[PDB]
Structure 1
């Protein structure tokens, strides 16, 4: 019978308006001593909002259904009279964002590795009719070995909440597709845009469309006049041009082949997809080894 007293609170990993994420230690039952991450959501801050209650139920359902090496695992889920609990696998490798901050710019082979693993998580989700929608570096974590882990499937993590309509404008919009920003309707092609923005950020040190303020940034994304730096490889530039297109339906990955279309691009010519999925490829960075 899984209950809050089954877990010892160790430390706070994140604090938002909707609740906290803890590192926890299981203290009862078979797994005694096992370390997990625990997300604790404030019911009363959710129960009033309609789209927030829906999103809370969706995260629960997605994570329980999905089993994939590059997507964070849900272990337990339970409720009390005021809190929702999610017990997820503890991931010790930090955020992808931290590795990018350390390095400034990734070498092509480094970027290629992360983008390739991401393309597989993305492909798996699309098979199940799930859309990720924001591939900003802070949404991607690394496991203890340094392999990719997609992890934001639930409520906005912020404390302030830009307006009270949606949660699009609460964090950075620098990796979101134009059609998300316009709310004109969208589909899985949004994830391939976003993979392109993350790629551009990895290879140049900054996202493709950044302005002084939020309005100028939005305007740059909608205009979608891509500036390809001339020192990227021919392969990297060709993939970026194909991912970062205003017209969603013409992006690489947007057709019937989905991840298959992106994976067949020459930028990924040195990737063995069976060995990658099996995690037999050594990551460029091993967080346990880092200082």
Structure 2
């Protein structure tokens, strides 16, 4: 006995949840120890092509550091981390609630009262990250997962889920103008992202789009905001204050940050203490018939100089409690 080793054989692969790129995400079942039978998401980085670029190494290690030090109800929980020769493994909680914005297609549009709830939850996660000097940067609708209870969970603090290739890699439609033209980034970028995510929640589409890439960049830089006439005056005001070309003029850009954004009349009905405690019932509680329940194409299961390696030293992790 002693502490549990925790290597790849401790987990059996149930199915693919996503694949890059620099690796793949599996739904797994713990098969050894007192945890035997518990469902997790397992992130597997192909580590031999991460060390070939500094910025990718930076993100991989930042992630591993952030998921250890940062623990928040609206952020994905890291349970185990370990490495095997050529591979990096992150064991995280299986978020059986799937993508939040997958509900959009089903709902058509989210109502403000609904959108407000989830936005309040995202803003709380953003608040905590900024408190710890972390800025997300490219926050997309796809980054917002949901736990088993239907509450928000921020994911993807890692490298890039894309196979193509890192702004401009994948989809750019939710990124602040200052990130696009690559001229400095700060906390304000995340409040833009919040605005863009809000607009998508309430219109089913991102604020500015184009037929091609060049036109899309231009449409964002021009920042000609079109607001649908079905939006309340409070929602109209928040989007106008969140989506400004000038990052300084943006809401939350100042030292007030999240609390400032959270003070907007749009959130006037949110009990923040209850929200953070998750006592508030979420508008989409998913119904699950087992712990290993999937509702999110994915199908077909595989893998669970030289010595210049000092980068992922101390990579191994097991989470408190």
TM score, norm. by length of structure 2: 0.87
Q: Shift of residue 102 of structure 1?
A: 1.2
Query: Alignment length, in residue pairs?
Result: 285
Q: Give the alignment partner of residue 113 of structure 2, picking from 100, 109, 116.
A: 109
Q: Shift of residue 143 of structure 1?
A: 0.5
Q: Shift of residue 267 of structure 1?
A: 0.3
Q: Shift of residue 46 of structure 1?
A: 1.1
Distance in 1 (alpha carbons) for counterparts of 2:185 and 2:169:
19
Could you give the per-residue CA deviations for residues 160-196 of structure 1, whole angstroms, max 9, x where no partner exists? 11xxxxx111111111000010110110100000000
Q: Shift of residue 135 of structure 1?
A: 2.6
Structure showing the higher helix proportion among its residues = 1
Q: Shift of residue 229 of structure 1?
A: 1.7
Distance in 1 (alpha carbons) for counterparts of 2:182 and 2:195:
20
SS at match of 1:192: helix
Kept after mapping to 1: 8 A contact 2:101/2:201: no
Q: Does 1:131 align with 2:135?
A: yes
Distance in 2 (alpha carbons) for counterparts of 1:102 and 1:60:
35
Distance in 2 (alpha carbons) for counterparts of 1:192 and 1:222:
16
Q: Specify the structure having the higher radius of gyration (Cα).
A: 2
Distance in 2 (alpha carbons) for counterparts of 1:47 and 1:133:
22
TM score, norm. by length of structure 1: 0.96
Alignment of 1:184-195 (within 5 A): 184-195=183-194
Q: Shift of residue 134 of structure 1?
A: 2.4
Q: Shift of residue 8 of structure 1?
A: 1.0
Q: Shift of residue 202 of structure 1?
A: 0.8
Distance in 1 (alpha carbons) for counterparts of 2:67 and 2:103:
25
SS at match of 1:271: coil
Distance in 2 (alpha carbons) for counterparts of 1:55 and 1:91:
22
Distance in 2 (alpha carbons) for counterparts of 1:142 and 1:100:
14
Kept after mapping to 1: 8 A contact 2:42/2:92: yes
Q: Shift of residue 36 of structure 1?
A: 0.7
Deviates more, 1:36-45 or 1:280-289: 280-289
Relative CO higher for 1 or 2, CA cutoff 8 Å, sep ≥ 6?
Answer: 2
Distance in 1 (alpha carbons) for counterparts of 2:201 and 2:62:
30
Could you give the per-residue CA deviations for residues 17-68 of structure 1, whole angstroms, max 9, x where no partner exists? 2110001111111211111110001011212111111111111101111110
Tell me the residue number matched to 2:299.
none
Tell me the residue number matched to 2:59.
55
Runs of 4+ residues deviating >4 angstroms: none
Deviates more, 1:274-283 or 1:130-139: 130-139
Kept after mapping to 1: 8 A contact 2:138/2:167: no
Distance in 2 (alpha carbons) for counterparts of 1:48 and 1:107:
46
Distance in 1 (alpha carbons) for counterparts of 2:287 and 2:216:
36
SS at match of 2:121: helix
Q: Does 1:83 align with 2:87?
A: yes
Distance in 2 (alpha carbons) for counterparts of 1:256 and 1:158:
34
SS at match of 2:160: coil
CA root-mean-square deviation:
2.2
Q: Shift of residue 230 of structure 1?
A: 2.1
Q: Shift of residue 133 of structure 1?
A: 1.6
Could you give the per-residue CA deviations for residues 194-253 of structure 1, whole angstroms, max 9, x where no partner exists? 000010111111110011111101111111111122221000000000000011111111
Alignment of 1:69-80 (within 5 A): 69-80=73-84
